[PDB]
Write a protein that binds this ligand. Structure first.
Ligand SMILES: O=C(O)c1cccc(O)c1
Ligand SMILES: O=C(O)c1cccc(O)c1
Ligand SMILES: O=C(O)c1cccc(O)c1
Ligand SMILES: O=C(O)c1cccc(O)c1
Ligand SMILES: O=C(O)c1cccc(O)c1
Ligand SMILES: O=C(O)c1cccc(O)c1
Ligand SMILES: O=C(O)c1cccc(O)c1
Ligand SMILES: [Fe+3]
Ligand SMILES: [Fe+3]
Ligand SMILES: [Fe+3]
Ligand SMILES: [Fe+3]
Lengths: 233, 200, 233, 200, 233, 200, 200
């Protein structure tokens, strides 16, 4: 069973988006009005599931094949998972979901007029390697309109979920594409107060990783909370 | 001061979180192996219980697109980190609220007692993480049981909550479902009876 | 009795910290939601007590003897009390309290593990002289952790209370020490939105005032609301 | 425009205010002379009364670490600014809420009427300043008496409050304590029945 | 026995303080007037003691326990010892000494009026690990007056002794604290001509390494002479 | 040119160096294991000797707060780097001068011959490092023996000192203390008879 | 930190200091009232003595253009600040060295004992300030007497001088001049037997 041997650097709640960000309408009623209660880390918080023995399918991470070929821009999304100390996070669970080339999600509630793609599902998962590397093969998602302001459009994005070594490190986020003119207009993106933090969410075109005459590549590294041994406790 | 690399910023799970993390719930074909709401198999040691609840917004309206992650010790107060569908008990699970009823359920066992860093025992509890559209960064809570009043009174975690009235927000109410021991745990994100959320 | 002859410059409520400052968790539930009701100044507001006849002990302002010798950095905290017009505020009451060298307060509810100092109490009072000068003799207090965020630490500080000429001028504040790296990270400090306002709370090392081979000195001036005569009222 | 030197910014009194301004309350040895909660000596002219109240936060919870300062006119509606323990009556006082019961008390006389700047008389009142951890800048309020409805009705200050309902939050409720005339003044910092706070 | 296999980068005597620095009065009569004689490195200079078998006590590095609890600011002083090539120096001896919270040393010759702390000695030692990391637990020392100019005050500091791999790398220095206003006025500090060299002597506040509700932490890294193998000799 | 990371700058040991490195001398309780002035157990091979000396400033006044470190080969001309209190012989030692007499002492054996990088034998010597208040960066010297003239005349190190007269400053003078072989080695930091100090 | 206005920087007196501060010495006509080397009138209480000396540069050469200022207590150990030619005793004086013989003289009384700030008595002394071309900022010293050995031994000032050999530089040598009690005080600015100079 797991053991309490680690401490995780405290989260900077001024770095991460706040709970109440009124331009993002839904946050109004879904944000707490009372202050969060701080508690010391115990084994409850410093441990988490290990997915090494989960039975991954052969194309769990290849969205081009896991659902004919999907229509859209063929891309590889790769990067590494490291902690705040710059240490790789091996055998960690990386999950992702997204819309198709038109901005359509394969979900009951998605009524957007852009058509579904009969060869695309939009879900992948990958366990990072010994060096903290992950990769997926998919198609570039399209932006889509949503009921916020009368003319709001989400920039093209991929949703990501990362496990890390504990429940203290677990994170849900979104990757944006370098140069997307929609980024600075987004109320969700704007939930993040510091511009420098926004930069962390933008995948960079990575020509070095592309497959000539086949597909482009984007690089997206993720930083989880720094893990340290306990001392003089 | 010393500055490390900044952590990647959180973002809301959004309304389609199910396609990615709750396949069955999104009503899409699932894969061979999925992380779902059954932490224990019939032959797992301990007292088998059913957990259910609803999630409310600041308007007292049901949040029907919520996603929840749970982490708990097994009946021996042990944390089973090696996740495997072959296991009789998994300490980790996932659940979500119905687009209709908007109620989540979990099948597990009552968690054993675990000690805090200082060697002090914490009352039986389940660690919860709440995700959904409208929530920029996930909310952390704990589920305690009403039938553990003695332990609950001495919990070093429960005790950090200044106001006694707020502690109540964390106690699940014991019931029965089809003659099965059940505990109801409702979450109120905002307002009157707002549930206590932690930072760690 | 007292008479209504003065008027006091209206307070700048954008200069002072606001009531609701979320990072300072306790302010959440302890800040009014309705606007303050402004009212004209009357004798009720423009008068206040005078402590010229209070019976002060001879060591009232000497924390080194008023409680052996306390352990810690021996310092002198001196300065002047003026109004916004630059006029000295003579015979006014200055009160201060602080933790010991380890950041431990001599109070019931302070359960911080740094020990108490048997020769230290942590309270002083001084009446300004005819030039608005006051002085204390103490030990520099240590920073201390508090239950705000999971790892919040107060910068070293001395609590101050100044009467002034009326209840309109009474003030409670905190003094910080020049160069303390904790200053900029404190959420109580940050309740003050203007960086310029913060600066005003920082005591400056004063070598000129030090007793060689004995103790250092810190200069801390206080500015109270400007006082003026009524006119064309 | 013309700008003067900026006033020194306010900071919360913090949780240990008592050690500096309410030694007895902090349970520490006091000095010879201390400024406290008994404004009038038994032989001071005027109707001797007892004041008591509690302080609530936005959640309806007692604020057990509040510190209050009061300023009032004597029976002759005069402000005695020359503070001396030898005096029969002092216009200035200090009180704090019990870490237990969480109630404050003061011993004084019902203040005489004073006029505003315009020469219009104000109903008898006590000026209060509230300090405490969580309050960045102290809160100013006034205490009024329920048995002075006539006067209260004409108050030029009280009449500045737009909504009549808000005015009632400033009126103390006459009672008796051990057959002694008392008046209970509860302060609500935020929410339902929030007390009026002034700026001047 | 030891073997002559290494060469150490020549010291930069313009980086380190010179011998004669008149503001530091004692340096006057204790600095050579003849130039140092340069000599080639031999086994005599390229080897030194290895303290791996020294029998360290369990609290050799904990000043809180090695002498009740001391009064003062609880801090952790940690860092790494690398060479100029950035290579870790494992299993090396790090020794430290310092005054108590009031700037008083537990030494016969210290007659400063600040009292001794009955529970504090002020001496520690630690052998670096595999990665060149060391760590001490102590209390922040206070500044103290000294008989140099008529009103001279040493900034708060910890004296450090480092062995390294040879007598060639052995070094004695002082650690100073981030933001201390006394730093720039100290004649000992000023013995160092290059401001950039001064910066290396300042320990930075390290919140990441602090124990919430217990103690702060400071990071101090040490760079010893670069070690290289001999070539074409 | 290529620039490496800069070495951490040296600082004076200060007047209280004894507290950290010469515990006994500071007149403070020692630890179980201390590094001191006895390099050789009485049963170690070689010619057992006693070393003693004084340290003078530029005014010819005794330096009574100096700290010294020594490094030498064993009698077989070998450096014993693994330091252990169990060893009969240790290559490394520590000494300091009396706050009173201001004299240091060391109990060792006469070092055997070592060769320089070129393969040329150096005369028997002890490597010394001098620390003390007023000394910003420690001073390096060597102790040679007066009864080894032959070897001394051919030392490649000693031969690097231009002036013959200066070489003389590194030669310890043989004596006898209580019928024990001793060598006196005085250090003159500055002025007339100033000791040769090295850079390497 | 706090910074005051910087003090006006000192400059050497220059070779012509006499024209401004020692008119007679410069060989120029003097004014009605001059500040000179006769502190005590024959009728002044105390032991009447003559002080004399020479000033030497670092080469052992006489400084024939020096200017000296003296401050001392009267025989009761009292400082007489109210300067008047009418006074039988003035605490202040001025002298200078002959362009010829290069010797200064002073006519005064032996000063009485004065206590330091801590209430400890200092041995009888004369405070001196030396000015001259080549001296950028004047030198402060003190003259003590060889016949106050008992007192000298206990002076907290003299005791601040680390090296006893240096303390002797401050001791004037008692002699007789034309059957009068004289003390010789030579000042060596630099080198062998360099006189202690103070900073305060
Ligand atoms: O912006 C917030 O974080 C906040 C927190 C609590 C109440 C409130 O009105 C606002
Ligand atoms: O929070 C939402 O309403 C939302 C809508 C669309 C995409 C997304 O990530 C979030
Ligand atoms: O931020 C405020 O100052 C404030 C004042 C009143 C209501 C409210 O929601 C916020
Ligand atoms: O307001 C607080 O909670 C607080 C806690 C510690 C020190 C202080 O000044 C204030
Ligand atoms: O400043 C120096 O390094 C120096 C070195 C030798 C003689 C001297 O006067 C000065
Ligand atoms: O060299 C000194 O005189 C001195 C005095 C105090 C501390 C220190 O490191 C050095
Ligand atoms: O010091 C000098 O030699 C000198 C010579 C001329 C003018 C003066 O101020 C000084
Ligand atoms: Fe989306
Ligand atoms: Fe405080
Ligand atoms: Fe020191
Ligand atoms: Fe001139």
């Amino acid at each position: 069973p797991a053991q309490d041997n680690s401490r995780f650097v405290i989260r900077d709640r001024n770095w991460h988006p706040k709970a109440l960000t009124p331009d993002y309408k839904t946050s109004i009623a879904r944000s707490p009005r009372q202050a969060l209660v701080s508690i010391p880390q115990s084994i409850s918080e410093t441990t988490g599931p290990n997915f090494s023995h989960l039975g991954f399918g052969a194309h769990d991470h290849d969205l081009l094949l896991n659902f004919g070929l999907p229509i859209g821009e063929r891309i590889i999304v790769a990067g590494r998972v490291v902690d705040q100390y710059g240490k790789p996070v091996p055998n960690t669970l990386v999950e992702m979901w997204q819309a198709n080339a038109g901005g359509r999600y394969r979900h009951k509630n998605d009524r957007y007029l852009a058509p579904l793609d009969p060869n695309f599902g939009g879900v992948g998962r990958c366990l990072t390697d010994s060096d903290g590397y992950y990769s997926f093969r998919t198609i570039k998602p399209g932006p889509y309109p949503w009921r916020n302001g009368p003319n709001d459009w989400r920039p093209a994005h991929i949703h990501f979920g990362i496990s890390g070594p504990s429940i203290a490190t677990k994170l849900i986020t979104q990757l944006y594409f370098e140069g997307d003119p929609l980024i600075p207009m987004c109320p969700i993106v704007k939930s993040i107060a510091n511009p420098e933090a926004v930069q962390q969410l933008i995948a960079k075109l990575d020509m070095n990783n592309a497959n000539p005459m086949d597909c482009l590549a984007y690089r997206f590294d993720i930083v989880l909370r720094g893990q340290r041994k306990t001392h003089f406790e | 001061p010393i500055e490390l690399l900044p952590e990647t910023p959180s973002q809301t799970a959004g309304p389609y979180v199910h396609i990615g993390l709750a396949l069955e719930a999104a009503g899409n074909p699932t894969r061979d192996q999925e992380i779902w709401n059954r932490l224990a198999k019939p032959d797992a040691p301990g007292e088998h219980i059913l957990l259910l609840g609803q999630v409310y917004d600041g308007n007292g309206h049901l949040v029907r697109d919520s996603f929840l992650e749970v982490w708990q010790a097994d009946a021996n107060g042990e944390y089973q980190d090696a996740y495997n569908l072959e296991n009789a008990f998994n300490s980790f699970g996932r659940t979500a609220t119905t687009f209709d009823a908007g109620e989540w359920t979990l099948h597990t066992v009552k968690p054993g007692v675990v000690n805090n860093a200082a060697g002090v025992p914490m009352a039986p509890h389940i660690n919860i993480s709440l995700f959904a559209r409208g929530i920029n960064i996930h909310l952390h809570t704990r589920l305690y049981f009403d039938d553990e009043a003695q332990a609950n009174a001495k919990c070093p975690v429960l005790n950090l909550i200044e106001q006694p009235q707020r502690r109540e927000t964390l106690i699940a109410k014991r019931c029965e479902v089809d003659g099965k021991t059940a505990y109801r745990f409702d979450i109120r994100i905002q307002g009157e009876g707002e549930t206590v959320f932690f930072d760690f």
